[PDB]
Amino acid sequence: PTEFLYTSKIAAISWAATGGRQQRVYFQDLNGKIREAQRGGDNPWTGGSSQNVIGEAKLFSPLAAVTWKSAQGIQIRVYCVNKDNILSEFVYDGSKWITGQLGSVGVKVGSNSKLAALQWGGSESAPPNIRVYYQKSNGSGSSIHEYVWSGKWTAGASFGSTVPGTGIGATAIGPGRLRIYYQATDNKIREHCWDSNSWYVGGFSASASAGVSIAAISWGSTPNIRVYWQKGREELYEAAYGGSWNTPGQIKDASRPTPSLPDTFIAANSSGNIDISVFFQASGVSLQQWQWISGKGWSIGAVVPTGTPAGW
């Protein structure tokens, strides 16, 4: 066995770095602690142990993460909720892990809410623009809320009517161009857009099993968007936009059918042009990933270490 909490949420990020793609994955352990696992290039994963704790949150807390490069180094922000359901934030300032200011704002989240976050603009010469999405109530037909950081935290918009505790996918397809994916009350995955001056319902739409976990990534000038969703113990689905949307298809391995455990979640990251990883929770309890090798295809990759309890 491992110390990976069953039905723990997952958050993942990655950036291209000289010497290879850098990846960081965040997950919760049996104690409610949020751990980090790291990967550089194709070398095996590291971390994921009790020495890799970056913070603590309520058990089964939702998770989201963003990153960008600044003058002080690599910036990372991890969002979660505490035992009182207060949206909280952990900060990696380029050299160490500390607690962010978001917690002091006192944003209350629905107990069964998921989280999603996106960022754009952040660089060595510019400040980041962060958006965090969450829900206030667990009831059916609830909307999605947004908190904005542009110098200080402030409430943003609210939109959509979703299934209870819907999965949420969020990606910045361009500077100031946002796309949010969630599951509507009719079980169809919908899209909300912000291109410059206002929010509006996007054209994307797809049928999915109730309660799927959702993730989204994007890159390029077109731009290209990939939306992923998965119901535990079912196969992973991918919708791809490359100027227009294709027909969603399954990503699977004939020799390893429905590898994820029931009621679990996924997370996806991307960097460069183009590397993609989709994480899921499997028997073990293990943290695994689907990896994309442009041109070739999808294959299940290396297992991420998630600790070993005492006595094993």
Ligand X SMILES: C[C@@H]1O[C@@H](O)[C@@H](O)[C@H](O)[C@@H]1O
List binding-site positions for beta-L-fucose: 24, 36, 77, 89, 97, 101, 131, 146, 153, 199, 226, 238, 298
Task: Quote the CA–CA distance of 152 and 92 in Å, as a whole number.
Answer: 18
Nearer to ligand X, 45 or 204 (CB): 204
Residues of this chain, 285-304, that bind ligand FUL according to CB under 6 A: none
Which one-letter amino acid corresponds to residue 248?
P
Question: How far, in Å, CA of 26 to CA of 170, rounded?
Answer: 17
Q: What does 202 bind: ligand X, its own copies, ligand FUL, none (CB cut-off 5 to 8 Å by kind)?
A: ligand X
- At 193, list the tokens: 């857009």
77 touching ligand FUL, by CB under 6 A: yes
Residues 85 to 144 in contact with ligand FUL, rule: CB under 6 A: 89, 91-92, 100-102, 128, 130
Q: How far is the CB of 201 from ligand X (least distance, A)?
A: 8
User: In whole angstroms, what is the distance from residue 120 CA to residue 31 CA?
Assistant: 33
CA 237 to CA 239: how far, in whole Å?
7
- State the nearest-atom distance from the C-beta of 191 to ligand X, in Å: 6
The 139-178 contact track toward ligand FUL, x by CB under 6 A, reads ----------x-----------------------------
Give the footprint of ligand X on this chain (CB under 6 A).
173, 179, 191, 193, 202-204, 241
Token representation of residue 148: 């904005």
Tell me how far, at minimum, the Cβ of 144 lies from its own copies, in Å. 20
User: How near is the Cβ of 145 to its own copies at its closest, in Å?
Assistant: 18
251 CB neighbour count, 10 Å cutoff: 17
Residue type, 285: V
Q: Which residues are annotated as a binding site for alpha-L-fucose?
A: 77, 89, 101, 153, 179, 191, 203, 245
Report in angstroms how near the CB of residue 119 gets to ligand FUL at its nearest: 9
Query: Which residues of the shown chain bind ligand FUL in the complex (CB under 6 A)?
Result: 24, 36, 38, 74, 77, 89, 91-92, 100-102, 128, 130, 149
